[model samples]
Target chain A: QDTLLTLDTPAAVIDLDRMQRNIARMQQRMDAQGVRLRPHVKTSKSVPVAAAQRAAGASGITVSTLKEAEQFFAAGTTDILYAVSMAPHRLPQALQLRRRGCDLKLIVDSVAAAQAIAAFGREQGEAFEVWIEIDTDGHRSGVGADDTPLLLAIGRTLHDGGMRLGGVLTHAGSSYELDTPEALQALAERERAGCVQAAEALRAAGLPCPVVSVGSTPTALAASRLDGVTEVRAGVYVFFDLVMRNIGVCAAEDVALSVLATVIGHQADKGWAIVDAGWMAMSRDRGTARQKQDFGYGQVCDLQGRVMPGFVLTGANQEHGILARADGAAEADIATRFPLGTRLRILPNAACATGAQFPAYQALAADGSVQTWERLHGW
Target chain B: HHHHHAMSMQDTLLTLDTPAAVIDLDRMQRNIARMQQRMDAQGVRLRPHVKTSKSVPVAAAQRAAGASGITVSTLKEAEQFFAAGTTDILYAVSMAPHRLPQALQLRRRGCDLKLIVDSVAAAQAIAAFGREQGEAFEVWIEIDTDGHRSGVGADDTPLLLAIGRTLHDGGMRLGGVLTHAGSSYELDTPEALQALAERERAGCVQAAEALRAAGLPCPVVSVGSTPTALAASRLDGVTEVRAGVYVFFDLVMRNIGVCAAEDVALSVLATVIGHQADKGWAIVDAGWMAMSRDRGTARQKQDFGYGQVCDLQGRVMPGFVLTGANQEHGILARADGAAEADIATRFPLGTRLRILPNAACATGAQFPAYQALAADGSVQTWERLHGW
Candidate 1:
């Protein structure tokens, strides 16, 4: 009897049917684009969710931390990429994963970091497979794609200094700022071309450049030509959120993860139905705050995973979520509408941030049964 | 922001792994003592909310400094603390009907756990459940003083009588009324904090008096918040006080003038992973994942971007902050003004730095455990409780 309504409040729940469909759709898109879909496992961190992705045709896995690589590798996945710029101190941790026959690859964005990896690899007697991170949109971290001198230096330092020059990778994280498919496709093409250009520059300079990876949830779904990209990686597409929904990548119904909560009390005059799920349940990720639509803390939904029009969690304390209308209009029948103990589901503004807050997810399947799916936390 | 820690009594903050939640023992001891001393001066009992730290040692230190009872936000906290021998715990969040059975289990197991309620429906259910189970549940009425969050309005005499009578008539132990001036976190001026605190005290006391006027027993009159507890000149008629996040002050509290940055006891011990030279940004591994997405200070007197960036020795590097953060990367930059020329040189690769988080409670939740560093520099691991 582990239905969605019966689970503990402030619980993370995944729509299994929606999850499988999201997985299949992403896989189908990558298939048509002729790129290997290496799903970033950081979004859902559960072994089974990644297994579902793999079963639906994900080539490998991508991780933001080595702990993810360790956990997913222990779950029997061999192709894992530690996609963040490699910290010198984490070299040994990466070395241990590779020594365990886990093909863990590291990405670096600077020449100094490359030297650190080369020095560490030479000392450990391990030719650790490493990739060069490229800066496509100058959004965050990584070397500029047009800057060949910097790219070749980073690749050559790792290769000539005794490490596998795996490939070039870039993430158009700036794509999260765009709302149109036209803008998304332009940035996506720029991202694809940036990584491909970086790879070609390295190859022309007599260095190894095998794989070319690029993506962000927005870019991956909006791309028209993924040509020359060996692999495409996206994290939050597996569990769409209000931010992505506003970005036009997916609809509110396509959002698979939501925080299950119960109305504990109410502030009738204020039209606030205080729920047990707060910022702790759904994270303080106001990602949609700057977007075209600002879903306050989160867009409010009912227990069956249906959106309650114009209703959202307007405010949140650590343990109390204030549910009210988005237009700031008070509901006089707030108590009668969402009385005490009424079960509801809240779609988070960002799925990955909310997923990291929970220890496990209660998966709701079409069979009307709920099963607890444990996820990895605390890298 | 997951980290691998090597915690022991021998390891110091300098040698601890990056992204570890760290507690400065001396500062916490000072913080605990200061709150207790202030509450004692105000002539009220201190029931420190364990919801802030959620660690056994952290609570024990507070208890040793003279905390009367404890306040927990979740049943898991009550269960965890009660098992560790703390019987008097107030489940601060208004009661959810489903959790009543679990609360009864703790009471059945010898915990003097008190439940809080804000609605007539909750009050009725608690009494109904207690009557069905043959347990007179100790309950408190949550009074909304500032119109900020939960609780019934203090002046709502009819509604208060209805909820209180339901508990008293149904053979339940109606303890008192509790109010939290949680809105005090948003104020920075001393006058504003002090004024809001009086409202916090006057409101709860008024609610308790109204209950007593109705011939209902209101034994306890509780009110507090980290800032209000410290700023209140006199907590008149309040029986006891409760405050979370005061034990480990953060940048939010610092901006509110209740504490200083150096007095902040908790910080994220991070390492410089890489740098963007021209931008004067050193990417640290402790991102929003380590320091949570708590931008509490963004609306304060000063916005400490992600957090106030400090050096390895806990010294405040003024103007430096984690301007932007990804899942596993924190971009440390000087937000005070112009970009510095020596980014990599100043914060070299692999160099450990301490970042003071915005909200201590949210930051603590991000880690599985804390590495408590004593004045001698040796550290001990304190496991943290998480999830509902």
Candidate 2:
């Protein structure tokens, strides 16, 4: 029931109304585009958040770890897409989930990985539904779109070795580095085309390629077409961050996640108002540093979540955040401006990183009521 | 059965799940002994900062190794460690006014929890709150020596005396003055570290003297940082030293010439999930989630991106480092310009490796507990409390 002003410092506060709005926006966009939206739970890792997404018409949940799959599945959600390259060591856990009737789909991009999964599936006497990760724009891990041989090899290994070849998924993570709308649209098309081509190749090789998934927060919102794509996945759009703000996808007010902090001390001469939310609270994700507008640590906001133009958290220790003018200007009257015990909200540069620091979020409703939403942590 | 018992010792470390924090017991003990011996030789008491580990056993180990008191960055750390039977604790961060109730609660429970403050307003608040609660809280003045973070300047005698007089005359125990030469982390040479150490010591000592000159009691003169504590040959007028991250030295410490990579006691265990041969990258399961987003060594002389890669046995893997990271995936590659085309062949799928974090204190905070491995390869889980 405690409000932001009364809550402890270094606590994560989520705007429940804004989060619902974000979910409805993405779900509505996917519904119009004719693709099932698989919301990435890796962003929230909270049961109620995912429940809200599901309530907003998200088809299923996507996870980055088996822990997420396990937790979400235990929460009564059966359909899950583990969107990371499957490590062979995690096969046992995946098999455990599959045997328990959870429809957990694993993704891989290598022939060796496919072969290992096939071997493990045969040994366990289970047909694990496996997906092929297609690399579009060479962002992180995945098979190249035109690498027909590698794509077919990975797909065929799963099919011929008695495993369910579920689908082909691509996450053009490089979409995060781009800011322009046209560039994002082009990358979105490239991500779609590459993933579709991989799915077509697998189908041409006589393998079942039912799903063609692709997304990133930027491209997911920028993509105007989804002709051949069947589904899309996106994380971080649930609570848009400063990086997303810099990407021109969302405005400053669109961001729903923030850290509630208190002004504990001030270095008046240096124009610094140190808060209790430091790197440990804000997280060291300088995702905005390389962006056009570099939010040093995070953008400083008022206790009511209103942006304080030009004020940014320029420095951070483990438990202390330094707030100053973004233009390198010093405020001589900083103490008078933000005296001791002043509570402020800070919007993190990357929502995923900052949200991971806390065990739970103090979700604020539109009516000014707050509820603690617990989140799953660690693998 | 006899052979199974022997094999169990080796399997404990190898069988540990990936992304688990592993502490080398032998190396940790050596680090403790080295630091404690240095403090003993200098005729000063060592109060190890528990912020780096946040584990009860880690602080207990330090206390057993002759550490007089423990320094913590948060009040929860004080409560957790104090509940574990360590009464003498220093809450080093500037006293947040709202946390005074918890501070009073701890003191009322017979925990000698000391609070620190840099501003006169904070000092007065602590004094007034303590008096109103019928508690004479032990308060220390934080002195800024290197100007890296919080604290009043060593030369700001007027402000120092005001804060001291406010605390002392307002029914509070003016314990001492404290400073951390954190700028030493940016120094790469021993000479620079030594100079900063001397400055840190002298600055804290100067503050204590200024308080004494003004007829205020300043019994303790505390100063330290891992680099300054080891580099400084003289303690002079300082009563005790406080250092964190020394208990589990990391890649940043290695680049600063304080500890060798092998001497680093904390590492994140990872498994190779996939690889991009063309880019010479082996994606690991230990991404920024396991190894924190602390690129502490990025600006150091040696930019060990994310972390320095080590083999399964905790041996350094020369030039390999995690060059890029996502939430759950780390891109491991060579520091050299040459592409590691043999990345997949070298570290095939499921290949286990240990990564030395750029900042062990930040990285260790990501985990719930550490897998403390002994020389015999047997392991035990040591609980690590998280959050403020």
Candidate 3:
């Protein structure tokens, strides 16, 4: 008997055609722009996408956790950037990888982080590469770009204390607010400019600043005009979403991922049908809630994978969606939309957040065969 | 990843199954019948949101008891039910940019599916996708009556009308306007629920009327929320009611006066492990993962700590709960008083007890099967579909 069953309702499914197109498009654009593409593997968390990225001429890859770095390394990808605030609990993992000859680069934002890494590196007799994080207007994390004293202090503390300071990294998370491709381009330039300025500042301060990285889906896609950035680290570009489209990063047609669901109930008199996927599968991303038209969670689509007409998930309970048609439309109007036990698909408003909920991806091939891509998780 | 050893039943009793979810079948069936009767008396279409239960067994009970149709949150639910022999399907979430392929495939596969969309961009996307793929899509225009979460504002008649026209022109069909009174959950009384229900009903009806006045055919008007459903009067323009959680009243529903504590149906089964005799607290094996991450009970008058501790017969044991939860451990303490013998029930290694659902939807989502306990104490299993 086959251990792999055709799950009527799988957690996440990846269409190879769309995913290949997305990856190829990004690589072509990046190649034309003469920039090395370090695709962030955080979106798919799948080895298959990483392999596709490599086949498409990706320079390397980026990850959030050290465990993820190890997983990718075991799969034969060497260049890895652990793009998270590194601390003591993570040092052992980093050192263990170093002992195994894995070229793992860890990120740092504070002197405390450097101190922890340096202490562990010395204690374990291992050398480590560090990237001083630069906060380029995105206030989520990283040391202020202008905070040179802290930067030099942490950089020197690590460089002189066993760990080598590799470079600087920043992410323009604020690019999520852009409303046009022009604004996306502008945000990308600004993010790149911040990293350049920070790198120059570090050089003037006599600190090593070889790597100058800036990224986000918007910044990475609109990198043609960005000059100062040395490399890009973006994830969601591999799987675009409504939030990305609304912000002008990718077209609606570029999204390559979806959550496969099943419709089990109907409110035909009210033009409503209930499905199996909800917040857990859809995620709690209400990206369009503040827009002129608030798409409740996401835009609903028919079972054939087309967007539904006037129906919107008016309300979503944990596992059920209340599908009501706009205007006073009869049940016959939606008669062809779906029937009992219809299997439909949905596109998420945001990809990164939604993708984080799952453990793997069901990779659909061109010939309609489906494969599996295991997602890496944990510290 | 830590699995602690089960403590000997010196003062506490419990059964071992290595993290099994236990539900009071008798309490659950009653909870379902009670809600069905409530909607039946109101003369409104009862479409229980299936996101809460996600189980075919639970859905069968609702359908057999009088629910017109079950509401689901995803297309995966639609497929699961269709395979289980459920025909009516609703893909409740909005169509974002990533999942359209699967939605289109379902239609091609001959499954009856309905989806939701709230924006003209979404409407255009769905329409264009349908036209390009030769797929017929059904959609609902969501209106925002209360802004607890997401919905199109009721006042945006022009946008709603444009969305309907766009879908219609694209060869897709428009169902009707739908709204949910999510704020009803915050109501302190049935009066508040009544007011929210009226507001929701009026908003959806107004949207439908606007569409009709503009020459669009608005056939169905719908609104729902378990709280609002219980307190609603004269659903006037509404044709269908979509609500879930009323079937298995949760502690939150009880706090909002939707149902009494006795009406709650499902619960987590746990066993007392060790006691901090000095701190007068006992530890249990059930934790946040086994129970849920929801803290609805924390806001209740008594807080019920983590959940209402119960005896083997499924009755609340006064004031006690295993509060602080780690990944796999629960810390229990006296809410008012502590009795050492109270833990001496010696529930053996496989003894069973029922725990109330903080939110019926959250608890139900974690389990794959529900054991239906009839009034006479016989039990049957009803299974559900999970994941998408």
Candidate 4:
């Protein structure tokens, strides 16, 4: 087993023990709620991470991009949901995936997209399963749950036009803006009620509505009950980050992903020890900047993964991260404290954004062994 | 290429896919010519940094337009460009201990790869590695002119001469001193930029003089950054200058007063997918994944949130910027807080648009390949290196 000290600098490291614990916690919570857990694969984008989620009892997987759907489908994931509102031009790719025996579910929010998908499905003689996206929080794309006419119209357009109208789905992405348990629980309830309301509206309109789905990482965990929901979807919970910690959902020690960096030089006068991990390594994701606590780039940690209190990445360039005290006061002995070639690990602000920076992650196991887990990139 | 025709073509002939990185060929060529002409006028060689655009065709274009050599941030870049026939390369980052063998391999392969070091420990490691391998590695000492990033202080003659003597005596080619006025990016005025450029030039030259005074062979004196390279009134003792983002002047550079907003050559082509009418936010397919999370303009005078939105034909939609961004979604809205009631119809579904990035290098890295739109409306895909 190789020690953490022997690996290269600016490498993405995943604590396997923490990752497994995260998977088990999420799966157990979903089991208690009596609903299927379809973990969103967009966060990790690694086959091994998804495999771990599936092995831990996640029934299906949710994807944000067609590339993810294609990649996961080839990796033996039969049931997949393309969560983003369908872009009309991507209909052909979805059709091709479904034709290959993938239970690929596509979501749509607008009438124009429904028309295109219906027309294409009819031309190809394929009954594509489609879900109507309901706008619960108005945070992103979806139709209003109160707008029954639009909901029924999209359902009819898919069903009558030779396609399968699976059900309705909603995501309370705005839940991320909330921190308190009461606010998150209220948002989670609203998300569940809104999707159920849309499904009831469609069923009353003589349209077949079988499944009702709802989730966001915050709502998924904060959700106390799921009465009308058949399944839930959430990403970014697998590898908890600074944003989730600020939201009070997870602790700093629960963060599974961190960037391993080395002290290259120092600006001792400014109380800054320059590390090799910078924006290129940690990514330009400032997801935690406006939160309750702004961990400049990231929270600094020791080589063995223990959080070094009060030390954070205060500034960053392309390949240089300035590690210093969070109070901005100069650490007079910064040069001596973190001399040249001293290794350190910096926990990222967002796991999804930070993980995307690397081509693969060095999965660090409790046994002190590290293995590379490849991650996909580009569209 | 007139304004009116460009607008009409943007409205009609723009048919590319969303979240596509598109390079304006005419603007890129002009940017290259401008930098080369300025460096030629100053009587110094121009070694354009290829780290900005990791594409071989882009670097080839710079060489054709009069760039002498290239500067890279990683050894992977050195290998990629050298394989593509650009031999003279400089790995600008300080030499990490583990990368010595890789550097030696490149040098052994007949590639004139130059490595830079700022610390005595790094110099000694390079010297030891070279002596162990029986290869005289060409090394340059990095100088801290602006106290921005990695480098030895200009006045630290003892440390400077020690590094030079260690490399020269330990069977290595003691190349020269190089400095990047990275702090020049913080300055906006022409006077401050020129002053910083002179300081960088003078400091690097002084390091070289100290090495020569110590009986060590030092020949090169290099200095640059996009801001300093353009503002330097003269390059007297400097042998060569290097700059990267000037080839695709971004909004950060625009705010820096070195280039106009119209001079930017790279833009991400996106399509209007949906809209939040009440918030006056039109969602596009290009987000941080495509535009990159480089909020470089946030700290500048003009905070172009995310990016400055442009219509299909590369015309800036005044006051409109990407105010918010999600993973694959960008929120285009007016920067002045005025809500447009007709934003949905204004940018209807399938409507094509372009977004100017805050930093060209980071934005370009997000895309696997770039679509180069030629002056005659032809498009070509130039593949770029992705990971290290």
Candidate 5:
């Protein structure tokens, strides 16, 4: 077991115990609701993290990019869903994955995209499985569930054009913007109702609508029931972050991801201690700035992973981070308090964005041992 | 001529993939020429910062346009450029103690690598490490012209002299004094920019004079920022200038009034994937992941949400900008609050568009390679270094 003392600075460290707890908590919640948990692998982008979720009874995996699908499918997990609206140029790549025996499902939100997918599938003599994206909240891409005519049109376009209208899915991404439990619950129910309503309309129109998927981190945990939903997809909950904490889904102590940094220098007069981990290490995702509580760049912690109250990353450059009191008052004894070479850990604003900055994560175990878990980058 | 034939072929055969980093070669060349001519007229050497466009051909083009040396943010840049045959280099950040060996190895390999330091601890560390390696390393003192970021204050004469003495007395070459008025980025008018440029010039020159007064060797005086470099009416005592983003002027530079939106050379080519007609938003494939989360224009006179959207041919689609961005989804809408009912038709599905980013350097880092689009419409892939 290697302590935090021996590892290199500016490293992405995953607390295994905390990670397992997060996985178990989510899986159990999904189980209680009687819906299969399809954890989004975009948060970790690591095979081992996905594997841990699978070992904890996660049914399938959700991916944002086809690259993640190829990577995870290559690792032996076959059931996958490429969650974003299918880019027309990417249909050939998706077809190749399906031909290789991957149960790769694609999602689309537009009639044109659906027509393109159908045309390509027909041109290749392959009935590709696709899901219609329903807009439960007016947050991002999706066809409104209330627009029954348009929903049925897309379903008919897929079915009549020789493709599998596998089901309907919706993501309540707006749940991230809510801070109260009542609002989260309301949005969760709306997400479920919308996806189910779309599915029922499709079935009434003689379209196959077996699977009904709906979720987001906040909605998944706050969801009371999944009566008509068959499965749920959620990311960012595997390693809760400050944004999720501010949204009241998880506490600060439950966060599994942190960047290990070293105090390289200090502007003691300005009450700033410069650290090795900067925007390049922590990423430029200022997701928490407009939230109820803004945690500058991130919340600061000690080498032991305990939150140091009032300390946060006030400023960040490419390779340097300025750590100081969050209230803007300079700490007078900053130089003596955090001397050169002293190590500290920083909890990021969003786990997904922070994890994407590093090439790999240092998976720290319960016994203080560490192992390297590689993560891929780029498209 | 061969150039004519290549241009014609480029125009006919260049097609880009969606969500690609595209560099307009013509604009980049003009930018290089403009900066080089100014530096020449001002009687100073131009050591162009390679961190903006970390590509060999880009750096080679800068050298061809009269840049003397290169400035890098990381040792990886130093190694990459040195391997590509550019020798005189400056590692612009404060030297971390652990990276001394890497710097030593680069110098040993015949690289005239100049290191910078701002603190006494860093200076002592570099000198001790240089002595241990039996090499007299060349070093520069970073002067804080404005209290923006790193570096010792120029007015802190004692600390400046102490750092100089530590390097010179410890058997190291006290090469020069350098300063960057990074706060110059916050200004818009020519008057404010010129004043900041003068302050940067005077502060760095004063540091050099103080070192010389302390019987230390000081030869070089370097100062610059994209805005100040373009706005400065004079560079009296400065021997060299360094700038990064001028190579691909972005919206932030546009707001600073140093370059126009049309002068931006870098853009992300995206495709319309879907639309929220009611919200007047057309979703595209390029998001914060493609164009970074640097809302540099958010506080400026014009807030180009994520970026200013342009047509496929690089013509500005005025009033159209990316209003919001997810990891892989960008919401393109009108900033003037008028909803376009025909957004789907205006930006149809599969239609290609280009987006000028808020900051070129941060946006370019998201891609593994760049597509250099020539005036003839030809495209070439230029790979870049990924991690430090």
Candidate 6:
């Protein structure tokens, strides 16, 4: 362990060993499905961790931005998918990658995108592969699976414009809102059905459709079965967060990431254990609000990383965390446990968002050795 | 007028000017060196995370101090570092489904990009597209070590393996397995970190071994956590360790026993603006906007409201607590004692106090430049951050 701590306060840390296990477990589950497992690196964004995932048998990886794709591509991970829909302004960068012998895949949901991409490919004298996003659940962007006509029209438009179609992709983002595994399963099924339907529709329309992508950590972890779905695109599963557990996607123990904090001072009078970690360390994600018990901000853990009995982070200020008695009592006994400058860890509500706060993660090894540092965030 | 002048002559001056960020450079440098040294001593590889210090100068410091590579939370940060000469970077975020083209473009620009995927859907989509477009992507299987955030289960390796093979066949190369012991941060002590490290390593190594047994090449086993980095003992199957905060130790690090309060490098400086005499609360111009919309510190033992208040000479002012703050103003009061004479003069109107940073990364991200404080108390300015 690096006893001489770094000076950057409230930075994100990663237990390398735990992180590896999280990635491996996700890969193992996806491999059993007889489908491709392309883990989203956005959760940790560490190249070392990403490399570990590849070593554990992940398929091509998914990224949120072109900059990430560029960084990974340079690292020799060529089959990259910039997952988010491209704004019109970014089209030139996509075409440029294609022109430079980079095998990049672009995603689109509307017919206008089809025409725009085809036109760009023609003008740039390059070809681009594309996935038509189908909305399984309306949470963000994507064409509804019910809109078969629109899907077919977009497919025809792409094919006629000389662009290769990579079939359908849909995410059960709404699954995060579910309260039980059963509810999450239903959403998973819907996501699968939606993608399958889109693929079928494209095939019916004489388009070459070979892929049906469905995703969301809730659906990926809780689905009893994934029938007819060609692939899954869950990102947050690597670091199962409070939000995922609350939504019945995974258990708290399944969460691989946490925020290490130290007690700088205490408000013994208020029964609060003041830690140096704030919203910056653990993002302001109140995912537990929808759960049976609302854990104000996050779950509190003891120095040994164990959850303190009847302890919760009741409220928070910028750089202070108030760990109060779960029952809201101001007992002196409870206050003693929180002394001046005590260290504690906070299990974050969202690993992706919290992990996003740091630039690199300290990789912990099986032999208890602090080994590698992984790079995160870009492009 | 003569009495006021005499007091002014006695009043202390802050180390840095307002609107400037001050990092205990020596402490930060030591923090970086110590994390690297400790990681090396423990036989673990150190990969420092970068989102906390997005500045090129800060990145350079980490690299100079012994960080192998950098981790970034946003693609913008990645680009900035890469452009600034740090090529080995990781975008620690999931790819939005609609943004594949941008990744391809980055590849065209000659960046070594590696990606993570935990879902079959994303795998198949990327594979099929790569097959069609003739692009090769390096992939990492994201495993869920303890369900802290997002990852496939170790029990789900078969699906990920299938995805790897499919992508390899299609065009992209399968990299390896990766996981984050993100839950280690919540640990209350070093012992907990050790336990969490066991869980982290066991899951990651198991999955990697499973893949190797299945005839897939498992080369890299990566994991990370600050507490684990400071507590874990074994690195049996791990190759690289990525921990970034070890560079600029904060109040949190001090509280955790990872570093000392004197080791904290970053702090925000604010001026006294007003006061509520009846409540014993003195107001400062720095509020949530100047500080941040975070309240993590108040819940700690000191409950310094926004931060640990320091005198002009950077000395801790005991019993002074920043009770409340608004967007542009902060209220400081005595935690359990009376405000002393020196305390009032030390934080008089327009007087600057060094306010400790909650999260160095977030606070640093807001500023354009850092006022590098020299050992001799001199100041040198650095450039701001760039890249979208």
For model 4 the local lDDT of residue B320 reads 95
Q: Write the per-residue lDDT of candidate 5 for residues A1-379, one digit (tens) a residue.
A: 5567776568899999999999999999999999999999999999999999999999999998888899999999899999888889888899999999999999898889999999999999889999999999998989997999889889999999989999999999999899999999999999999999999999988899889999999999999879999999998999999999999999989999999998877887899988888887788888889898788878999999999989999988877898999889989989899977789999999898888877789999878889999987767
Candidate 6 regions off by >4 Å? Answer: A1-11, A331-335, B1-388
TM-score of the second chain in candidate 3: 0.89
Poorest 10 consecutive residues by lDDT, candidate 2 chain B:
B5-14
lDDT agreement with native, every candidate = 0.90, 0.91, 0.69, 0.88, 0.90, 0.67
Rank by DockQ, descending?
A: 1, 2, 5, 4, 3, 6
- Individual DockQ of the candidates? 0.78, 0.73, 0.04, 0.50, 0.51, 0.02
Tens-place lDDT digits, model 4, residues B149-172: 878888899989888888888889
The TM-score values for the models, in the order shown, are 0.98, 0.98, 0.56, 0.95, 0.96, 0.52
Model 2 segments beyond 4 Å from truth?
A: B1-11
- TM-score, cand. 4 vs. native: 0.95
The A-chain TM-scores of all the candidates are: 0.99, 0.99, 0.91, 0.98, 0.98, 0.93
**lDDT digits (tens) for residues A1-379 of candidate 4:** 6568777778899999999999998889989999999999989899999999999999889998888888998999989999877777777788889989889999888787889889989899989899999999988888898888888889989989988999899989898799899999999999999999999998888889898989988899999999999999988989999999998889999999999998877766687888888888888888888899899999999989999979999888877788999988999989888877888999999898888888889999888889999988778
List chain B TM-scores, each candidate: 0.97, 0.96, 0.89, 0.96, 0.96, 0.88
Model 2 per-residue lDDT tens digits across residues A58-176: 88889998999999999999999998899887888999999998999999999889999999999989989999999989989999899998998888899999999999999989988
Residue B263 alpha-carbon offset, candidate 6, angstroms: 38
Per-residue alpha-carbon lDDT of candidate 1 for residues A1-379, written as tens digits (9 for 90 to 100): 7887667898999999999889999999999999999999999999999999999999999998888888888889999999888888788788988999999999888888899999988998999999998989977788988988888888889989989999999999988888998999899999999899998898888898899999998999999998889999998999899999988999999999999999999999988999999898888889988998888889888888889979999999989999999998998899999889999999999999999989899989897688999987786
Better of 5 and 6 by lDDT: 5
lDDT of 1 at A300: 88
- The DockQ leader among the candidates is 1
- Residue-level lDDT tens digits of model 1 in B1-388: 1234433235776566678999999999999999999888888999999988899989999999989989999999999999998988999999999998899999999999999998889999999999999999999999999989999899999999999999999999999999998889779899999999999989999999999999999999999999999999888799999998989999999999999998999999998888878888899999999999999888887899988888888999998999988888899999875687899999998889999999999999988899999888888889989897
Q: Which of 1 and 2 is ahead in DockQ?
A: 1
- Count clashing pairs, candidate 6: 255
A136-163, model 3: which lDDT tens digit per residue? 8743456677777877888888888888
